[PDB]
Amino acid sequence: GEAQRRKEREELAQQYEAILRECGHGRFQWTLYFVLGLALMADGVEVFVVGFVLPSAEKDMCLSDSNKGMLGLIVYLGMMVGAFLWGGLADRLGRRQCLLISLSVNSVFAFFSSFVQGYGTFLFCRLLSGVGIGGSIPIVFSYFSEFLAQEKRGEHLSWLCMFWMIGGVYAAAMAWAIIPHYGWSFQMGSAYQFHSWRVFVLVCAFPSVFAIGALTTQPESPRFFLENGKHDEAWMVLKQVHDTNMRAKGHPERVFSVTHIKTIHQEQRWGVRALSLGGQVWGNFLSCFGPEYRRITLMMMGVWFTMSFSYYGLTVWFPDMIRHLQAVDYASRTKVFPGERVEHVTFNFTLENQIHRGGQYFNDKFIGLRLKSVSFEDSLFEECYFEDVTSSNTFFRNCTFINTVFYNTDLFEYKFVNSRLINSTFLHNKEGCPLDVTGTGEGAYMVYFVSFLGTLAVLPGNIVSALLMDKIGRLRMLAGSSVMSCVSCFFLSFGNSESAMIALLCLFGGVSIASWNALDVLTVELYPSDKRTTAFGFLNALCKLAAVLGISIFTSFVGITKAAPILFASAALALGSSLALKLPETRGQVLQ
């Protein structure tokens, strides 16, 4: 029984490869390449939106700690759910069908989140958008693989990763050209406010809609039709491929010589259908852990987990380290004024990064002052008057206030730490958040630039892989790029300034891309066409879970030491390369 099924599958794969060789490479392949490139660009854009809008949403929504981190991680949680779900569903519903469904869900919820005012609703909308876009990568790669002959499969598949970098560049450019315009205050509804980061979210949800629009005009992959017992539509799709290719070539007169293609033999209602779909998906997932695929699946799991953990940890750790260095410089530039006795006089100033200690102000009226990271310590205020005072990161510690009036000030109760107020009156307090939210100004600009640089770092290595995938092999490229990634992780210690961190981030991003391309091609080529998307989606869910763990750990390791992240990344990459070197070779084989 098993032998007959294996023979049928092998013969079907061989005939399919022969048909694809007969049709050739041409206009149809490039058109589908661009369509799925848009589908992948949507995914590439999706991972930057929350990170780019957090500085503004934290003030526009009164975001505290333990809520910004969840906002950051919700996209990866949504991707982890969506990758598995759509990878499981694509082997039973179709690659194009599930791609349309998931992309439409992503577009709908990304459009909805652009107008949502609350936090829990924003978290839910972003989680559902991540669920929608989670399954873009596995479905796109398995869908593009089934239209390529064995002569050039790694090259044509690795050309498909340029669009992830293009999406990253697009997100960086949109953030640079949209977010800095803080003056935009469109008003629709008195209780609601429309800022520029919502416009950024809209423009970032645009590429998923464009991808759906491009995907409406592409046919289903013939291989899914053949596996599922449908031979007429598979033959029609192959004929359409042949006609398009040969019409582009310049010979629109030859005839599709293929007549018959052997097909795999096939052997309350809503609830029954859902139960059947769940059972079949669970069966596919369990067969992925079968006697034939049990070593391969475990090694693939290890490689995906290790490389995702290391890459995501590093790519989140680099901006955090840059920010920590900038904060250290800022705190090193702080000025100190120990002791000052001040008599009756009106006070006007805008102070940045100062500490006044041991002050004694008597009958001083502070009118219209902006305070930025200004701290008063050991001070005594008597018969003072604060009017039109606005302050951020300002604290009054060990201070005593007597007969003082705070009129039209945002000096809330959390800014008076270990302070004693006697007979003091708070009048007409300005509207503000109950707790500190910090402030981000011009320093956001460079951040976008940094991200842009990182994405540009991917540009060279990709090309090399695209020019060398079929010359050396997937295993050799994977190992030889993981080794360089480990070398860069060790080299990490030779940098303590912002420029050094930028150069190191660019180097790591430019080195790991070849390994990622090889991993994608290898996981495409190592699984049969009836389990390709299920396995790819499961491995992508594992990748997203590893990304979450790595992000959490490497954020917890910022500002403590530079040895723990280096050790973790180097160990994980070494283990991943070791596990990868034992995989089987798939170059020069039919897509079986």
């Binding site: 009036v405 302070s419 107020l421 006697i422 007979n423 003091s424 009156t425 708070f426 009048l427 307090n429």
Partner: protein
């Protein structure tokens, strides 16, 4: 049934009961100008009151039940000197045996002690961190009952607060003379107000305590936030009981303008001494007599008055157009001579139809004696606008819960000590 009852008279304090208690008063004891029956005691040796009963009415038994009642006003405690400073205000202990009532930071304590030096203490506690307090600087009706067989109980405003068994206590002796002075107060600027001190030789139950509370409450006269009499030509700040976190404010002057509820209120803080809400915010309301024939300035029930409103230290008049859309019609503050024929007359109500005392309410009526309705607030497009409506009267007729027809008048007082 009353043995001692101090009541003001012509420049003296007289016992109403048929016992002729001898009362002597110090030279630094004050009397309020409007309500001379209220007695003010300061933290001075001279500010003293002695009362002397007869030898036939001295509490000297073991099975004798007895009760005391009075009205007390205690200002706010401002600084840290006041905690852990229990000071006696009324005393009747001699040879270490008797009864006394004292005050501590947010506490009113009643103490009994017998010949065996056994202490029984019944305490009422009120916080000082509340936004709006019911006891800080406001008149409080305190009644203490003692049944030697069962319990000693305290009652604040006619409701039970604390009770403690005293059956273990032995024979309680009482002084021939009763004290009224502040003893043991370290604060040298601390004073109290007491009035209507009554003594009974039996334990009162809930019914007698309650009807005594109504009898001594003077339900026929309006009261301000502090419990004093409501007076004409005196600026009052406005507080709404239903919405106590917003103050009455105006934006424009005239018919095109409206008065609304603007918030939130400020705060007055002294770092774990008090965290009160600011009471001197908004626009002051002055009451002008129109048809009240009484010579005094006291505002009584069913008085038909005018309501001036103080905006930027200028006096305007409350008025509204009787003929506009809807029953809930907006109120406005407009110039005094230009009012013309818009409705001005407001009837002050203190007690309900049955005579049960409630808070201050204002019923706007026109020149023809037709009730425009009670004054309250209604929400128009997220603005709490002051309106005169018949809806509150309809709810009162149906015995339903009215929403926002109850107001409080807060004059500036020294016991609050807020900076304006």
């Amino acid at each position: 049934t009353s043995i001692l009852s101090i009541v003001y008279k012509k420049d003296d304090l007289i016992d109403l009961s048929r016992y002729g208690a001898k009362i002597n008063i110090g030279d630094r004891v004050y009397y309020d100008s409007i309500d001379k029956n209220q007695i003010k005691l300061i933290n001075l040796e001279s500010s003293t009151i002695e009362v002397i009963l007869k030898n036939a009415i001295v509490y000297n038994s073991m099975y004798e039940n007895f009760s005391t009642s009075f009205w007390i006003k205690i200002p706010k405690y401002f600084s840290k000197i006041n905690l852990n400073n229990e000071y006696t205000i009324i005393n009747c202990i001699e040879n270490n045996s008797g009864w006394k009532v004292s005050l501590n930071y947010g506490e009113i304590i009643w103490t009994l002690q017998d010949n065996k030096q056994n202490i029984q203490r019944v305490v009422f506690k009120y916080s000082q961190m509340v936004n709006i307090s019911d006891y800080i600087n406001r008149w409080i009706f305190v009644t203490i009952t003692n049944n030697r067989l069962t319990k000693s109980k305290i009652y604040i405003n006619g409701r039970l607060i604390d009770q403690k068994p005293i059956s273990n206590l032995g024979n309680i002796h009482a002084s021939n003379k009763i004290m009224f002075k502040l003893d043991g107060c370290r604060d040298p600027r601390r004073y109290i107000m007491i009035k209507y001190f009554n003594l009974f030789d039996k334990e009162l139950n809930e019914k007698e305590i309650k009807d005594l509370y109504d009898s001594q409450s003077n339900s026929g006269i309006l009261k301000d936030f502090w419990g004093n009499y409501l007076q004409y030509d005196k600026p009052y700040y406005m507080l709404n009981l239903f919405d106590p976190n917003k103050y009455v404010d105006v934006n424009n002057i005239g018919i095109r303008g409206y008065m609304y509820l603007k918030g939130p209120r400020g705060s007055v803080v002294t770092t774990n001494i008090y965290l009160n809400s600011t009471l001197y915010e908004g626009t002051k309301f002055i009451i002008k007599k129109y048809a009240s024939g009484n010579e005094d300035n006291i505002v009584r029930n069913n008085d038909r008055v005018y309501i001036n409103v103080v905006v930027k230290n200028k006096e305007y008049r409350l008025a509204t157009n009787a003929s506009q859309a809807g029953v809930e019609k907006i109120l406005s503050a407009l110039e005094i001579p230009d009012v013309g024929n818009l409705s001005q007359v407001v009837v002050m109500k203190s007690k309900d139809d049955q005579g049960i005392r409630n808070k201050c309410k204002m019923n706007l009526q026109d020149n023809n004696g037709n009730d425009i309705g009670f004054i309250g607030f209604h929400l128009y497009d997220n603005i709490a606008k002051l309106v005169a409506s018949n809806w509150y009267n309809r709810q009162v007729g149906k015995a339903s819960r009215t929403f926002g027809c109850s107001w409080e008048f807060i004059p500036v007082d020294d016991g609050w000590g807020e900076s304006s």
